Design a protein around this ligand. Structure first.
Ligand SMILES: CN1CCc2c(N)cccc2C1
Length: 150
Protein backbone atom coordinates (compact mmCIF):
# COMPACT_ATOMS: atom_id res chain seq x y z
CA UNK A 1 0.00 0.00 0.00
CA UNK A 2 2.58 2.48 -1.25
CA UNK A 3 2.60 5.26 -3.89
CA UNK A 4 5.73 6.97 -5.23
CA UNK A 5 5.20 10.46 -6.70
CA UNK A 6 8.11 11.74 -8.82
CA UNK A 7 8.11 15.57 -8.78
CA UNK A 8 10.15 18.12 -10.80
CA UNK A 9 11.32 21.73 -10.32
CA UNK A 10 8.52 24.30 -10.48
CA UNK A 11 8.53 26.85 -13.29
CA UNK A 12 6.21 29.76 -12.66
CA UNK A 13 4.37 27.47 -10.25
CA UNK A 14 4.07 24.62 -12.83
CA UNK A 15 5.59 21.17 -12.15
CA UNK A 16 5.32 17.61 -13.46
CA UNK A 17 4.22 14.55 -11.40
CA UNK A 18 4.78 10.90 -12.34
CA UNK A 19 3.00 8.22 -10.29
CA UNK A 20 5.10 5.06 -9.67
CA UNK A 21 7.36 5.93 -12.59
CA UNK A 22 4.88 5.06 -15.32
CA UNK A 23 1.84 6.51 -17.11
CA UNK A 24 -0.79 5.57 -14.56
CA UNK A 25 -2.88 8.62 -13.67
CA UNK A 26 -6.48 9.17 -14.81
CA UNK A 27 -7.95 12.62 -15.45
CA UNK A 28 -9.92 12.43 -12.23
CA UNK A 29 -6.91 11.24 -10.17
CA UNK A 30 -4.78 14.02 -11.67
CA UNK A 31 -7.18 16.68 -10.32
CA UNK A 32 -7.17 14.94 -6.93
CA UNK A 33 -3.37 14.76 -6.98
CA UNK A 34 -2.85 18.45 -7.72
CA UNK A 35 -5.34 19.36 -4.97
CA UNK A 36 -3.22 17.25 -2.58
CA UNK A 37 -0.36 19.65 -3.37
CA UNK A 38 -2.73 22.66 -2.86
CA UNK A 39 -2.41 22.97 -6.64
CA UNK A 40 -4.66 22.90 -9.70
CA UNK A 41 -4.24 21.52 -13.21
CA UNK A 42 -2.48 24.23 -15.27
CA UNK A 43 -4.27 26.23 -17.94
CA UNK A 44 -2.57 26.32 -21.36
CA UNK A 45 -1.48 29.89 -20.57
CA UNK A 46 0.07 28.89 -17.20
CA UNK A 47 1.83 26.06 -19.04
CA UNK A 48 3.07 28.49 -21.75
CA UNK A 49 4.62 30.84 -19.17
CA UNK A 50 6.22 27.86 -17.37
CA UNK A 51 7.75 26.84 -20.74
CA UNK A 52 9.18 30.33 -21.27
CA UNK A 53 10.87 30.14 -17.83
CA UNK A 54 12.74 26.94 -18.72
CA UNK A 55 10.18 24.12 -18.29
CA UNK A 56 10.46 21.03 -20.47
CA UNK A 57 9.81 17.29 -20.02
CA UNK A 58 9.68 14.18 -22.22
CA UNK A 59 6.38 12.94 -20.77
CA UNK A 60 2.66 13.23 -21.55
CA UNK A 61 0.65 14.81 -18.75
CA UNK A 62 -2.74 16.40 -18.09
CA UNK A 63 -3.30 20.13 -17.98
CA UNK A 64 -6.84 21.65 -17.90
CA UNK A 65 -8.50 20.37 -21.12
CA UNK A 66 -5.55 18.62 -22.80
CA UNK A 67 -2.65 16.24 -22.48
CA UNK A 68 0.66 17.84 -23.38
CA UNK A 69 4.45 17.84 -23.34
CA UNK A 70 6.26 21.17 -22.91
CA UNK A 71 9.32 21.24 -25.20
CA UNK A 72 12.20 23.70 -25.43
CA UNK A 73 14.91 21.74 -27.27
CA UNK A 74 14.00 19.61 -30.32
CA UNK A 75 14.50 15.92 -29.58
CA UNK A 76 13.36 13.15 -31.90
CA UNK A 77 12.08 10.87 -29.12
CA UNK A 78 10.15 13.60 -27.23
CA UNK A 79 6.96 14.82 -28.91
CA UNK A 80 8.46 13.93 -32.32
CA UNK A 81 10.90 16.86 -32.49
CA UNK A 82 8.37 19.63 -31.76
CA UNK A 83 8.99 22.73 -29.59
CA UNK A 84 6.48 24.79 -27.57
CA UNK A 85 3.63 23.19 -25.65
CA UNK A 86 2.96 20.07 -27.72
CA UNK A 87 -0.64 18.85 -27.57
CA UNK A 88 -1.43 15.11 -27.79
CA UNK A 89 -4.03 14.73 -30.55
CA UNK A 90 -4.62 11.00 -31.21
CA UNK A 91 -4.37 8.25 -28.55
CA UNK A 92 -6.41 5.11 -27.60
CA UNK A 93 -5.62 5.36 -23.91
CA UNK A 94 -6.51 7.50 -20.95
CA UNK A 95 -3.72 7.21 -18.39
CA UNK A 96 -0.81 9.67 -18.35
CA UNK A 97 1.24 11.72 -15.88
CA UNK A 98 -0.06 15.11 -14.65
CA UNK A 99 1.16 18.68 -14.43
CA UNK A 100 0.09 20.77 -11.42
CA UNK A 101 0.21 24.50 -10.80
CA UNK A 102 1.00 25.97 -7.38
CA UNK A 103 0.21 29.69 -7.31
CA UNK A 104 2.32 30.30 -4.16
CA UNK A 105 5.51 28.93 -5.78
CA UNK A 106 8.22 31.41 -6.94
CA UNK A 107 7.65 33.29 -10.25
CA UNK A 108 10.48 31.63 -12.20
CA UNK A 109 12.61 28.45 -11.80
CA UNK A 110 12.30 26.83 -8.38
CA UNK A 111 14.50 23.72 -8.36
CA UNK A 112 14.38 23.20 -4.62
CA UNK A 113 12.98 19.90 -3.28
CA UNK A 114 9.33 19.31 -2.43
CA UNK A 115 9.01 18.40 1.27
CA UNK A 116 5.25 18.00 1.87
CA UNK A 117 1.91 17.05 0.37
CA UNK A 118 0.21 19.69 2.47
CA UNK A 119 -3.37 18.81 1.58
CA UNK A 120 -3.39 15.00 1.62
CA UNK A 121 -6.16 13.59 3.83
CA UNK A 122 -6.44 10.67 6.33
CA UNK A 123 -5.84 7.27 4.70
CA UNK A 124 -3.76 4.08 4.89
CA UNK A 125 -1.36 4.69 1.95
CA UNK A 126 2.34 5.34 2.42
CA UNK A 127 2.83 8.27 -0.01
CA UNK A 128 6.40 9.13 -0.94
CA UNK A 129 7.39 12.32 -2.77
CA UNK A 130 10.51 11.53 -4.76
CA UNK A 131 12.63 14.50 -5.95
CA UNK A 132 15.02 14.37 -8.91
CA UNK A 133 18.03 14.66 -6.57
CA UNK A 134 16.73 11.57 -4.73
CA UNK A 135 15.41 13.38 -1.63
CA UNK A 136 12.33 11.75 -0.12
CA UNK A 137 9.43 12.88 2.02
CA UNK A 138 6.91 10.30 3.21
CA UNK A 139 3.51 10.40 4.88
CA UNK A 140 0.58 8.11 5.56
CA UNK A 141 -2.56 9.41 3.89
CA UNK A 142 -4.72 9.36 0.77
CA UNK A 143 -5.61 11.82 -2.01
CA UNK A 144 -8.00 9.86 -4.28
CA UNK A 145 -11.68 10.78 -3.90
CA UNK A 146 -13.01 8.61 -6.76
CA UNK A 147 -13.52 4.88 -6.10
CA UNK A 148 -12.77 3.86 -9.73
CA UNK A 149 -9.27 5.31 -9.17
CA UNK A 150 -8.29 3.05 -6.23
C1 LIG B 1 11.64 9.33 -15.27
N1 LIG B 1 11.49 10.35 -14.24
C2 LIG B 1 11.94 11.65 -14.74
C3 LIG B 1 11.63 12.77 -13.72
C4 LIG B 1 11.79 12.34 -12.39
C5 LIG B 1 11.63 13.28 -11.36
N2 LIG B 1 11.33 14.53 -11.73
C6 LIG B 1 11.77 12.94 -10.01
C7 LIG B 1 12.08 11.61 -9.68
C8 LIG B 1 12.24 10.66 -10.69
C9 LIG B 1 12.10 11.01 -12.04
C10 LIG B 1 12.26 10.01 -13.03
Amino acid sequence: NQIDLNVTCRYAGVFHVEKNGRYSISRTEAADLCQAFNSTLPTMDQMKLALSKGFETCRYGFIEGNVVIPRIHPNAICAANHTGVYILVTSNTSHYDTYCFNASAPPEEDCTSVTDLPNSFDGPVTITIVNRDGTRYSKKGEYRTHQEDI
